[PDB]
């Protein structure tokens, strides 16, 4: 399938070169998979989600996304126009308040929630969790991410936006999950992207158009935007049967575009997420 005039990041993930604008992908489109977006919520009523998104858990007075960040990330996973995996099921877990903040204890509870809640959902092709959040190093936060991954969920986490080594941030620093840095449309490391040995992969993260609250759209930047590209890619590849939740990060690294990004510090992987779809 071909989506013309796609957001640059979608075109990038199906291309061996920057500078194109059509996204190519197998029409299975993540059907039968599920992606949890652990964030500020999801505006499930947005026409872009086509009834495929729902809130399943909140720790606050509402499950609605009063911020936009979670809706934007969910849109990059799975919206019809802005999403990588256009037929996946999206499940929102609101661990962040409408200011975008959350206590680590709530975030940990949300990860353990997903590890159990997947057993209440129909995801025959597999389960992914996208975590566009983080703070300073916490062994307990890393352990929660490791448990979620161990339970059979492909965990993708943001590297962070500090232009620093991600070893000092959580859950970015957890070895067993997929830690995602950000790149721009010219294949440069995003100016804010964390780096370091703990990163597994880069995805598009600068000037990413996606859904927003109030039935709208906007373009924003962050490792928060790169992470759902990788989460959606994992769901798409799991639906194709090419990989599993336990192996998808490694498979994405195996099959990435290699050596094409600029300003990658010595010791950080030079790997850009790529679907290897041959139309």
Swiss-Prot record:
GO molecular function (one): serine-type endopeptidase activity
Per the database record, which ranges form the Peptidase S8 domain?
A: 7-279
Q: What reaction is this protein's catalytic activity?
A: Hydrolysis of keratin, and of other proteins with subtilisin-like specificity. Hydrolyzes peptide amides
Per UniProt, where does Ca(2+) 2 bind?
16, 260
GO CC, one annotated term: extracellular region
Keyword list (alphabetical) reads: Calcium, Disulfide bond, Hydrolase, Metal-binding, Protease, Serine protease, Signal, Zymogen
Active site: residue positions: 39 (charge relay system), 69 (charge relay system), 224 (charge relay system)
As recorded in UniProt, its EC number(s) are: 3.4.21.64
Q: Which cofactor does it need?
A: Ca(2+)
Q: Cite the cofactor comment.
A: Binds 2 calcium ions per subunit.
Q: Where does Ca(2+) 1 bind?
A: 175, 177, 200
Could you tell me the Gene Ontology terms of the biological process aspect for this record?
Answer: proteolysis
Q: Which cysteines are joined by disulfide bonds?
A: 34-123, 178-249
UniProt KW Cell wall biogenesis/degradation keyword: no
Q: What does this protein do?
A: Hydrolyzes keratin at aromatic and hydrophobic residues.
Q: Which family, according to the similarity comment?
A: Belongs to the peptidase S8 family.
Q: What is this protein called?
A: Proteinase K
Q: Which organism is it from?
A: Parengyodontium album
Q: Which residues of the full protein are shown?
A: 106 to 384 of 384
């Amino acid at each position: 399938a071909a989506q013309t005039n796609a957001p640059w990041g979608l075109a990038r993930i199906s291309s061996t070169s920057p500078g194109t604008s059509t996204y190519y992908y197998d029409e299975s489109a993540g059907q039968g998979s599920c992606v949890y977006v652990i964030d500020t919520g999801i505006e499930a009523s947005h026409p872009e989600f086509e009834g495929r998104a729902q809130m399943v858990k909140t720790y606050y007075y509402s499950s609605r996304d009063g911020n936009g960040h979670g809706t934007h990330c969910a849109g990059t996973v799975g919206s019809r126009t802005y999403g990588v995996a256009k037929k996946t099921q999206l499940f929102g877990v609101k661990v962040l308040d409408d200011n975008g903040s959350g206590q680590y204890s709530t975030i940990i509870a949300g990860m353990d929630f997903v590890a159990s809640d997947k057993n209440n959902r129909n995801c025959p092709k597999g389960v992914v969790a996208s975590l566009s959040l983080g703070g300073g190093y916490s062994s307990s936060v890393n352990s929660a991410a490791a448990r979620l991954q161990s339970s059979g969920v492909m965990v993708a986490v943001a590297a962070g936006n500090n232009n620093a080594d991600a070893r000092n941030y959580s859950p970015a620093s957890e070895p067993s999950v997929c830690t995602v840095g950000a790149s721009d449309r010219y294949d440069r490391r995003s100016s804010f992207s964390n780096y370091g040995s703990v990163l597994d992969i880069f995805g598009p993260g600068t000037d990413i158009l996606s859904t927003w609250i109030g039935g709208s759209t906007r373009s924003i930047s962050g490792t928060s935007m790169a992470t759902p590209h990788v989460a959606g890619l994992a769901a798409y590849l799991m639906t194709l049967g090419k990989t599993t939740a336990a192996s998808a990060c490694r498979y994405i690294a195996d099959t990435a575009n290699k050596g094409d990004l600029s300003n990658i510090p010595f010791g950080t992987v030079n790997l850009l997420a790529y679907n290897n779809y041959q139309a």
